[PDB]
Write a protein that binds this ligand. Sequence first.
Ligand code: K
Ligand code: K
Ligand code: MG
Ligand code: MG
Ligand code: MG
Ligand code: MG
Ligand code: MG
Ligand code: MG
Ligand code: MG
Ligand code: MG
Ligand code: MG
Ligand code: MG
Ligand code: MG
Ligand code: MG
Ligand code: MG
Ligand code: MG
Ligand code: MG
Ligand code: MG
Ligand code: MG
Ligand code: MG
Ligand code: MG
Ligand code: MG
Ligand code: NA
Ligand code: NA
Ligand code: NA
Ligand code: NA
Ligand code: NA
Ligand code: NA
Ligand code: NA
Lengths: 122, 60, 153, 196, 124
Amino acid sequence: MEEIKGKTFLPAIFVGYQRSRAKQRENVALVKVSGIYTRAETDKVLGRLIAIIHSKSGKPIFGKICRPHGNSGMVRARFYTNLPGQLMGHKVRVFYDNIDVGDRATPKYERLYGNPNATVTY
Amino acid sequence: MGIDLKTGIKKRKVERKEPKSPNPYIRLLHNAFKVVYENTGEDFTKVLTKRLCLSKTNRP
Amino acid sequence: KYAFKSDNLLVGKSRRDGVKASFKNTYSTCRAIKGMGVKRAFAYLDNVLNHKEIVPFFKFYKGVGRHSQARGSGTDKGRWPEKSVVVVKDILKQAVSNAKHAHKKEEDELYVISYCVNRARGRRRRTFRAHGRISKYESQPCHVELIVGPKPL
Amino acid sequence: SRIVIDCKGHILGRLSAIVAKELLHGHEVALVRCEKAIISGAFRDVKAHYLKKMHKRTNFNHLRGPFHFRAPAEIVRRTIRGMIPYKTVRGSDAMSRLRVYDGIPPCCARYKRVVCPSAMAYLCLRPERRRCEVGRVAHEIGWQHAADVERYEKRRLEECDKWYQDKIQIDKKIAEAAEKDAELQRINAELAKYGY
Amino acid sequence: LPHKIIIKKRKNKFIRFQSERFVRVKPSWRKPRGIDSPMRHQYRGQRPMVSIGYGSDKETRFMLPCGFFKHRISTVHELKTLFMNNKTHAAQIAHGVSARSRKQILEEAKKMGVRVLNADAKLR
RNA sequence: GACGCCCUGCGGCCGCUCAAAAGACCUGAACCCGGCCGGCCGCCGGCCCGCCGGCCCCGUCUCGAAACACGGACCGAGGAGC
RNA sequence: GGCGCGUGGGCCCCUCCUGGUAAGCAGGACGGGCGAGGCGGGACGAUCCGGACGCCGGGCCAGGGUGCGCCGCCGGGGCCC
RNA sequence: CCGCAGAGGCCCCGGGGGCGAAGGCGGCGCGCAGGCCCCGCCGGACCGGCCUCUGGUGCAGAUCUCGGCAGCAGUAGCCGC
Ligand SMILES: [K+]
Ligand SMILES: [K+]
Ligand SMILES: [Mg+2]
Ligand SMILES: [Mg+2]
Ligand SMILES: [Mg+2]
Ligand SMILES: [Mg+2]
Ligand SMILES: [Mg+2]
Ligand SMILES: [Mg+2]
Ligand SMILES: [Mg+2]
Ligand SMILES: [Mg+2]
Ligand SMILES: [Mg+2]
Ligand SMILES: [Mg+2]
Ligand SMILES: [Mg+2]
Ligand SMILES: [Mg+2]
Ligand SMILES: [Mg+2]
Ligand SMILES: [Mg+2]
Ligand SMILES: [Mg+2]
Ligand SMILES: [Mg+2]
Ligand SMILES: [Mg+2]
Ligand SMILES: [Mg+2]
Ligand SMILES: [Mg+2]
Ligand SMILES: [Mg+2]
Ligand code: NA
Ligand code: NA
Ligand code: NA
Ligand code: NA
Ligand code: NA
Ligand code: NA
Ligand code: NA
């Protein structure tokens, strides 16, 4: 937890998955950011690092903001691993500073299948 | 998906391409003449290979 | 044939097979006696023999009635089975004797640490019904085993 | 932190919608003075609607629901429950984060209250539209504590009025001290460059 | 030998319809064939259906996670013959070979530089 | 199926023969059940695992079956184009 | 050209008809559908509105909608039990 | 094409086996799948990969047949003389 110790941030909330009234897509999470009320203002925060804290382990899980959602300032985010349903309604951090987590924030599909024709060596 | 392919098009046709006989002599001859036709495009050889593929009821 | 095994190696044991007593009543009696000191267990069984204490039923209780002697035990049902009590007293006495003589232990530190009751094959009789029909009239015996040892913990 | 809303002059349905959305996002909200919420429409129509609602009960056993509450706070709570998935764990935890009161009891008299202007009657209804307070309807359908609520609110209001002057003087002194202090001046000047 | 990364289009097995509700129905796959069958129609909530399309890339089909191809043997002669392409093929000793034969086979394989997948078996 | 020790007797323990109790007997599955030890409701999917989303009971005759249409408590073995 | 199977109880929509007071009634006609067509919508439906299907990642968007349940909204003109 | 039982052959000094075969239980791996393989425990004498040949050759249903067995339930009941 000390990797993010004393780093100021803009608060946010995780309000659920991308969905319709028939299907659910847990690859994507919808996040509401404080002080953002319009699609353009969201355009001001695109591609920034975020984190959420697992109520058990205590370790932070990192992700990135991808694109807007709707007209009223919601955004879509992807995490290092997909989130359980128990976290719905918790707080996420949008850090003001710049951190270097390496690849701690890249989704699993991109990590494992960046290029389909990669080679394994020995 | 989502395409129309049954408006001005007919069903495929089935034709013989191999002799169908267990006799190894006929297989050898058919393959040799097929090679010759591949390398020259002559009509005599094409008709010969087709004839060598025919069934016994079609070879009086 | 013993379902109990461990490294305690200071336990007395006894068993009987094909006991001609109801399996459900015997199960209840053995479950009731578990975790007691041997002296208290003997006193309790003798008290049940003359309706001073009761055997609470936790498993086979559909027709068992409510009685005031069962107050404060976790259930309001119980009965006073006598055949089961006699059989269980015999087996417990044998186990205590086996423990005392083999390991020279005294009777003031022995507890009832384990038990197991299993269903057995019974004798078949027949009964007659209306309109010339015949039904079965079988019994429900059991196998019993009791273990006495130093203390649960 | 808990959000405490003063429901005087608010429209019941619009306030319920806002509060339900807030509850589902993980906030704790408390509603005070629920007897002053407003329902649009003539008192006769509102009363007839509520009497009709009270007429539905299980024919073979009235103890099996539905239940019809008469106090304004429970009326408001039921209206909010209508806008929430209360049969699931997610919605069942949301309804446990909500508190509703008639008047302002001691457990909430020390909080900072807010309003929602988008759900207030003086901005939502035309001047000539009829309206009524949930307190009058509740009294007409069986609520027993209207007069007691009024008495307690009067007493508390006078006591609060006594407290305002001390706050006035203390605030004046704090303002003068803050103006005098030098460290705050630097912060204010720094913020003024951003328009804050 | 280096190779492409192995992808498995599906990780779980294809279970037969309704085999969780009856002991008499085994989980091995059968094609559903009823007139009213809901898994034949493939409504939204049902389990997936077998089809060509789940097939593995044929560059890495039958490849073990270690990156080798399996070859089952039972004699020392079987090992010596047909193991000149030791680059891609590993040996697996059959179940019924005894401990003495296993000793001899392991010595020969170690001499020939051939990998043995179940080398630790029957070693107590 | 030695000996020894308990037991008012019924029986029990400990051990003995044997490679092995294989102890009235080869192996010893399923259904059903008792003890101890861990959990809290079925299937599919995502996940740091109990949260979210989806899911009417099959076979059959039938224009049309979840049907208040029929057969089916459960398990094993047998069972119908030669 | 040869050999051969199943089928020979059908029903619904659009528009056009006949008997009947009428009927989710009975009988006919061009085209389409269900039967034998997954998926989204029409709260809910074999047939309606879109779209006809190998297993996946990304983008665009039909039909239908955008207070809260429940993914998604604003601006302008008129009327208003 | 997968699997079952049997027949005719092969299995480089002549296929595997009490240094443990068939079968049973639990767990990995491989295959779109039917299935196959390996490991651990039990068991105690047989077993089969490939080519050709043969068939009384694959079960959820039939108010199916034979055997075993559950809930109901410590229930109904143990009223003539
Ligand atoms: K019918
Ligand atoms: K009937
Ligand atoms: Mg009789
Ligand atoms: Mg008679
Ligand atoms: Mg697979
Ligand atoms: Mg799951
Ligand atoms: Mg669900
Ligand atoms: Mg039939
Ligand atoms: Mg008929
Ligand atoms: Mg009919
Ligand atoms: Mg049906
Ligand atoms: Mg069979
Ligand atoms: Mg007919
Ligand atoms: Mg009709
Ligand atoms: Mg039909
Ligand atoms: Mg069609
Ligand atoms: Mg929404
Ligand atoms: Mg022998
Ligand atoms: Mg035969
Ligand atoms: Mg069967
Ligand atoms: Mg009863
Ligand atoms: Mg009775
Ligand atoms: Na034998
Ligand atoms: Na249906
Ligand atoms: Na019938
Ligand atoms: Na029946
Ligand atoms: Na549909
Ligand atoms: Na085996
Ligand atoms: Na047969």
